[PDB]
Amino acid sequence: PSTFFNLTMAFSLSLLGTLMFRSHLMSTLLCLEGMVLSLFIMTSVTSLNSNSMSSMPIPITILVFAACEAAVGLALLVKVSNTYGTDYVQNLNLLQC
Amino acid sequence: MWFEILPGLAIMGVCLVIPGVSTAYIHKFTNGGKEKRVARVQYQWYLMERDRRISGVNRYYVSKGLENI
Amino acid sequence: MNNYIFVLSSLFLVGCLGLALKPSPIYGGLGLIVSGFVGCLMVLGFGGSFLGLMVFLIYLGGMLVVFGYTTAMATEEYPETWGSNWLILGFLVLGVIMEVFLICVLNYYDEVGVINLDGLGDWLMYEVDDVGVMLEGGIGVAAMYSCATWMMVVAGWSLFAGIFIIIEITR
Amino acid sequence: DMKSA
Amino acid sequence: RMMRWNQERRRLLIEDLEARIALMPLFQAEKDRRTLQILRENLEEEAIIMKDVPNWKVGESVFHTTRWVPPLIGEMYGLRTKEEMSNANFGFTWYT
Amino acid sequence: NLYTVIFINILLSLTLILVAFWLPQMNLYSEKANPYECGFDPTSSARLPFSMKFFLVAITFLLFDLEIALLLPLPWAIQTIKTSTMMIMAFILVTILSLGLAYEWTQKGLE
Amino acid sequence: RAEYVVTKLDDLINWARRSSLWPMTFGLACCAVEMMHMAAPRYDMDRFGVVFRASPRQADVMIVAGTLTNKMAPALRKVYDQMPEPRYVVSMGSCANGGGYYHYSYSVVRGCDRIVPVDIYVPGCPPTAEALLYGILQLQRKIKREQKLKIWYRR
Amino acid sequence: PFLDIQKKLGISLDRHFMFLSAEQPYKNAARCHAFEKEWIECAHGIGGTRAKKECKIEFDDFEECLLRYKTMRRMHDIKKQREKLMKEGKYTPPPHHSGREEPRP
Amino acid sequence: NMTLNFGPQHPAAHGVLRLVLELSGEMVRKCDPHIGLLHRGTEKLIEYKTYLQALPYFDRLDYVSMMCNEQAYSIAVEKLLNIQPPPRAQWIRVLFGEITRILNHIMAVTTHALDIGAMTPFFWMFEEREKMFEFYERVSGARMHAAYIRPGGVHQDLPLGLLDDIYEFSKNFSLRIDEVEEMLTNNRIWRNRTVDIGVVTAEDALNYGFSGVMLRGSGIQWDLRKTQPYD
Amino acid sequence: AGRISAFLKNAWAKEPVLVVSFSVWGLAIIMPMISPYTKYASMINKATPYNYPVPVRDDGNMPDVPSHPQDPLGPSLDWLKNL
Amino acid sequence: FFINILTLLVPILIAMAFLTLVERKILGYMQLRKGPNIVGPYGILQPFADAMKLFMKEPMRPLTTSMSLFIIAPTLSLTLALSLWVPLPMPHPLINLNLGILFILATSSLSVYSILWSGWASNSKYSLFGALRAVAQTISYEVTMAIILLSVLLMNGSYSLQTLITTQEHMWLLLPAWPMAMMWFISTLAETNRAPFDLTEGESELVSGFNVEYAAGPFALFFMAEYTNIILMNALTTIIFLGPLYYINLPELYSTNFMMEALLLSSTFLWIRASYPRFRYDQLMHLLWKNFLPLTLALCMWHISLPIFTAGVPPY
Numbered sequence A: 001p002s003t004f005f006n007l008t009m010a011f012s013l014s015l016l017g018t019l020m021f022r023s024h025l026m027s028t029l030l031c032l033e034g035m036v037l038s039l040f041i042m043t044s045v046t047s048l049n050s051n052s053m054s055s056m057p058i059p060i061t062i063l064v065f066a067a068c069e070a071a072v073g074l075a076l077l078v079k080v081s082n083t084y085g086t087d088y089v090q091n092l093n094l095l096q097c
Numbered sequence B: 001m002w003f004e005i006l007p008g009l010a011i012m013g014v015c016l017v018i019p020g021v022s023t024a025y026i027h028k029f030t031n032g033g034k035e036k037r038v039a040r041v042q043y044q045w046y047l048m049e050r051d052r053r054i055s056g057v058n059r060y061y062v063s064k065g066l067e068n069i
Numbered sequence C: 001m002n003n004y005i006f007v008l009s010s011l012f013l014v015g016c017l018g019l020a021l022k023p024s025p026i027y028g029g030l031g032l033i034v035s036g037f038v039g040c041l042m043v044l045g046f047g048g049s050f051l052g053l054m055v056f057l058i059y060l061g062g063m064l065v066v067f068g069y070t071t072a073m074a075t076e077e078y079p080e081t082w083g084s085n086w087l088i089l090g091f092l093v094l095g096v097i098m099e100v101f102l103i104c105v106l107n108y109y110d111e112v113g114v115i116n117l118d119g120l121g122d123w124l125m126y127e128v129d130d131v132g133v134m135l136e137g138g139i140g141v142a143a144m145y146s147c148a149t150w151m152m153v154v155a156g157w158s159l160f161a162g163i164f165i166i167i168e169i170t171r
Numbered sequence D: 001d002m003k004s005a
Numbered sequence E: 001r002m003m004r005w006n007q008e009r010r011r012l013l014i015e016d017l018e019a020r021i022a023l024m025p026l027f028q029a030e031k032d033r034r035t036l037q038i039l040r041e042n043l044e045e046e047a048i049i050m051k052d053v054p055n056w057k058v059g060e061s062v063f064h065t066t067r068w069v070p071p072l073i074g075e076m077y078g079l080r081t082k083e084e085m086s087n088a089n090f091g092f093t094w095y096t
Numbered sequence F: 001n002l003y004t005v006i007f008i009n010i011l012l013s014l015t016l017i018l019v020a021f022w023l024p025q026m027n028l029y030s031e032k033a034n035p036y037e038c039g040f041d042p043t044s045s046a047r048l049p050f051s052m053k054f055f056l057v058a059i060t061f062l063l064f065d066l067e068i069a070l071l072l073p074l075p076w077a078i079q080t081i082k083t084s085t086m087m088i089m090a091f092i093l094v095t096i097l098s099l100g101l102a103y104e105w106t107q108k109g110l111e
Numbered sequence G: 001r002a003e004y005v006v007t008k009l010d011d012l013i014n015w016a017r018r019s020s021l022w023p024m025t026f027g028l029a030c031c032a033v034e035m036m037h038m039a040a041p042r043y044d045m046d047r048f049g050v051v052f053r054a055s056p057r058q059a060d061v062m063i064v065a066g067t068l069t070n071k072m073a074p075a076l077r078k079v080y081d082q083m084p085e086p087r088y089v090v091s092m093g094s095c096a097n098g099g100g101y102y103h104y105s106y107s108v109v110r111g112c113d114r115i116v117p118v119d120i121y122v123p124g125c126p127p128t129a130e131a132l133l134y135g136i137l138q139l140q141r142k143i144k145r146e147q148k149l150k151i152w153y154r155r
Numbered sequence H: 001p002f003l004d005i006q007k008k009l010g011i012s013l014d015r016h017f018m019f020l021s022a023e024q025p026y027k028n029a030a031r032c033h034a035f036e037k038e039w040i041e042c043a044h045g046i047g048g049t050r051a052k053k054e055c056k057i058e059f060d061d062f063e064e065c066l067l068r069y070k071t072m073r074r075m076h077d078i079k080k081q082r083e084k085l086m087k088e089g090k091y092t093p094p095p096h097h098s099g100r101e102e103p104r105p
Numbered sequence I: 001n002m003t004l005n006f007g008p009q010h011p012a013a014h015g016v017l018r019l020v021l022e023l024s025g026e027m028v029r030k031c032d033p034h035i036g037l038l039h040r041g042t043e044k045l046i047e048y049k050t051y052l053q054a055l056p057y058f059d060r061l062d063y064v065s066m067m068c069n070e071q072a073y074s075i076a077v078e079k080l081l082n083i084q085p086p087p088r089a090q091w092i093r094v095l096f097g098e099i100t101r102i103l104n105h106i107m108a109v110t111t112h113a114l115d116i117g118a119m120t121p122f123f124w125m126f127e128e129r130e131k132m133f134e135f136y137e138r139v140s141g142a143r144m145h146a147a148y149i150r151p152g153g154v155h156q157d158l159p160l161g162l163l164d165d166i167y168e169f170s171k172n173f174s175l176r177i178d179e180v181e182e183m184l185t186n187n188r189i190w191r192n193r194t195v196d197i198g199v200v201t202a203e204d205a206l207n208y209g210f211s212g213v214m215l216r217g218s219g220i221q222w223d224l225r226k227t228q229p230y231d
Numbered sequence J: 001a002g003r004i005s006a007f008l009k010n011a012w013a014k015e016p017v018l019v020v021s022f023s024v025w026g027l028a029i030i031m032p033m034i035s036p037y038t039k040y041a042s043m044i045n046k047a048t049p050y051n052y053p054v055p056v057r058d059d060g061n062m063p064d065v066p067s068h069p070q071d072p073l074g075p076s077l078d079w080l081k082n083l
Numbered sequence K: 001f002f003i004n005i006l007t008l009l010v011p012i013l014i015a016m017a018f019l020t021l022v023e024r025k026i027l028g029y030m031q032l033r034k035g036p037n038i039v040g041p042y043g044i045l046q047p048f049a050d051a052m053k054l055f056m057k058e059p060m061r062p063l064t065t066s067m068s069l070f071i072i073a074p075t076l077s078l079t080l081a082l083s084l085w086v087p088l089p090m091p092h093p094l095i096n097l098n099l100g101i102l103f104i105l106a107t108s109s110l111s112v113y114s115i116l117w118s119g120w121a122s123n124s125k126y127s128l129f130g131a132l133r134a135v136a137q138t139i140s141y142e143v144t145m146a147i148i149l150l151s152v153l154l155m156n157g158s159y160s161l162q163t164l165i166t167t168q169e170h171m172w173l174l175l176p177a178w179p180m181a182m183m184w185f186i187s188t189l190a191e192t193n194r195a196p197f198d199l200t201e202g203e204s205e206l207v208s209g210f211n212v213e214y215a216a217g218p219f220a221l222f223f224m225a226e227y228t229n230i231i232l233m234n235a236l237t238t239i240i241f242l243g244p245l246y247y248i249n250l251p252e253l254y255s256t257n258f259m260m261e262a263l264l265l266s267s268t269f270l271w272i273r274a275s276y277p278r279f280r281y282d283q284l285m286h287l288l289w290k291n292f293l294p295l296t297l298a299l300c301m302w303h304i305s306l307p308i309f310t311a312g313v314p315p316y
């Protein structure tokens, strides 16, 4: 109830964080990881409040595609950081040509 | 010779043989002469709560045997 | 401990606010380690001790590896803290003022909606079975080995192909 | 030999 | 020796679980006699509380079917003290 | 119990920090609080882009961390009726977990 | 009469500093092999409780061994300033005493007393590890006999 | 589209944990399993659009069982009226809700 | 690339050296050593003194191999003055120069072990080094800086009963050398540490001015004791 | 066979770690075909009473299940306690 | 409860300082020195004097640091290492946690975070190399740490740490798992960061690694958490892989068996610290990931294989 409303307020603020860019794309990856952390907390309190043990490894596969997606983005930021020197998103201005 | 490590190792040894003995003796002191029951699953905690209510002084460590009825 | 999970989820909202206002990502990693510890005792207060503790372990390891990544690559000459920029700290003050206003309007202004703040503590877990033995969530997580084997096979093949993904990308 | 192995 | 210890430990768990499986309907007859009594204590101290406020029947349940809905922790012990409520809902979990 | 041992442990560590700070004298200067690189003026800032070379091994740690997280419910998974099903599929899962490292060791990913 | 309590607490607060003094893993010298000879198990450091910690922040005292040259002088003093304020200087060696050899040379600082405050002077180009064990014992009794809480009390 | 691969093959890759009333690890029941089983057995063979009109009472009863929203309103109203009667002085101090009660068993 | 100064104060630089390293990652690209942190002007200061006043520099230049350098300087002065040493003094030269060889190789194996991280022969070899510095103090009276080799042969004679103590040192030194060879050569850590790392070619070892143990590690046979017969 | 035997012989001399991991992995491959105790753990996990087995309604068709617990006729565990 | 946490926490700090004392004494006995016997009655006073003296040692607030994270790292390290000790089983644990070995594994994964926080917030290049090699030590140790803590605990079949005490009453656990004990030993050297696998506080690599900018009491807290982790994971290897005798009427005989076995295991921990040369993180990642990772996965395969090979599965 109130914990889930504060969870969806944390998700709305995590969406407000990841739908803007301030310094790096690494902090946007950090915002996506906090977003999927509060998503995990939502999934575990639903599957623990409903007392359903069948839908309990759904948080495990949520964390599997969460950290695999963050792993993919970290190799991506390895390639764009050793290409560009620094990984600022304001330097990414050569795709409008 | 090799004697000089041993009184320092013994004064480390009494300070390492105190804590388990002290927590077992204070478990015996705190819970009725018995030990504190580990609740691994919910059945042990429900039996714990039924012992607390059966003793009736909101303390589980005393236990009513055949002499209650 | 009646308002335990509510004050933990308020600390989750404060930590996600500190991640949301977006510093240099070293401080975001510190705040998200704080919020991951918060979510660890949030799940660990509910009754299922396995889930939040293993995702505390996962978020500690993965946050340590992205923390090494953000002290390796993604840094600059002057690191922006939460207090180094007054837009970030002023937005933190405005965000905690907004959450004080949100618990005010959900406490005593109209009190109309599915969200309630008078329902503290008693509407936390709705029904837990008291007499049964298999109530720990480890066998519920372990259901993917026996009944839900397909998503387990799918996730293992996903990390096999993800090892192939990272060795394709980082060459 | 096998013994050195 | 791990084989012998594992087989004797599974015999020990199946002996203790056989004691549990013979002990459950004494626990279950204890369980429904209490959770009907604490709900009747809720029904007794509902007519004292809301006899003045209109269109609210005492003993009312919002569920449409006449089957026994399982009583919750909040509907069971929500009228009691906060210490007993925290000992009920945080009982197994915070015994750590 | 875990909350009060974490609370009293961080309170004793906080009063250890406070008795570290406020018990000696307080006198600092700029040459004292200059940072340490065996006693030299800063050739560069420390917060600069480090191009370290264990990056693919680090992401293989993250994927292996995820793999041991799905390996982790195994003492509850061994208590099941479908022992041969979890046996064959868990054999397949930790076999491809070893095979990912076998491909990384073949294709020089761990260097 | 709390002056006895002040002097006994001063001796108790100087007992830990005189016993568990942690020096700096220094170099810079021909003489610096005798720091390793105090480390060597004949005339021992660690029996008196002397541990070669490399960091100045872990260090309590700088044993300046020997040759103090002009290129090494800001590297000496920038290390010595960043050592925190319980800090003493032993000067091992006549080049750390007064510029023992190389006195009238062009690029040797003429003693370590030119730069840092040196609390104790150990002579020798061999200072014997007995002689810097005497230097550690005499710096030890010097910071024993200093009276910080006593001069705080009559302030 | 739907493309019905599990429906053609007959093996449930993910159909055996779709609802709340599915089979459980050693049969430990989910909450409102009876309500969800009654809603699914109501909803089989009627379709979704006629299931909205015909099983509206069963869906509202199951949704009230899961979200417990009118139960939350009922507990909140009885606690507010208990608080107002405690400030008024009509209410006695409860012996069964003051911690002095006889515990059964 | 960080322009990291390695610094004198870090103890694996032996107290003195400022390396700078423009390193990308920890894979070091180039390492530029500015030695000169211990520059004392010995070659300026030797000129303004006499020859016997110029003797005890060579106690202190290679300060972990002392009597080898005053053997070098006095053999240069005796080759300048065309003075042959007496043969008893020449056997004193080769005996204490090989005590000095054992000294420098104990320091080499020891500081190699301390720089890798084996802190054990930083004390185990140093006990026998204290046993050798008893002999240094027995002959000269200083533990390190003897100035015992002069031009025209050595300064004094040995104290009596020394050679029995040299023999009783040398019969016990072999088990400690075999003990360190047991502890640090056949092990797995040093075998993982010291294989295909820092290989130099023999062309680079000749063209870079490498001499002595660098050339013997590169495999060419260039000791300066049998190829060029001195002393 | 001699070339692959000299390959696996020299691998166990030089770097035996991966080949002994492969050897005990192949031992875990060839385990359950010749394991005689491999059909006992699943019925032990069937025979443990984690739930309550619901007592059936008596209708008097056949005595396939017992009407009394402690008498040993019925599905017993007397060949499992002697293991 | 408060008397119990005082007699658990204050004697473990006194025994940790006395462990530092006997560490320096048996380390100097390995290096042929008598050790610090002057300042105490056979030297029983020297790390108490170190913990006294580092209080009125001057702390450091540098220019380049962030002081809040710089001072929140060692207090979290002391709280970390002293609240890792509470789910230890002993005779009877103070915290009877139902799955407490995962809390041990999680807070030892938290133990390689405050060192990275310190090495970043110190704002030195030396501390940044120590922090990156702490990340490299995480990359080395963590997955083999979890697989050795998984596969031999599958023979116990439960993550309750109390259930391992009843498993090994008559025989030890290194007799069914001898390669797992030595591979646990060399991975807990990496978690403990001792001198075989110390690669992030080393005087020959850097200027003491991550303790570059840390003086005084925060350095005392890091040294406190360091040696608390030493005696902590000596007790972890003691409580998993070796089985002392359990009598349920006499836990004191079990506690002195724990004392003699833990003193020989801490003696072999500081013996294995003071013997070997110190690694480099290239072959640390190479021998763990190439050699000892598929050996842990293959003995993990053999521990999949064992409860269907014989005897059924372990109890809950």
Ligand code: SF4
Residues within 6 Å of the ligand: G029, G030, G031, G065, G066, G067, G093, G094, G095, G096, G100, G101, G124, G125, G126, I060, I145
């Ligand atoms: S006093 Fe003599 S030996 Fe000592 S440092 Fe100076 S020249 Fe070198």
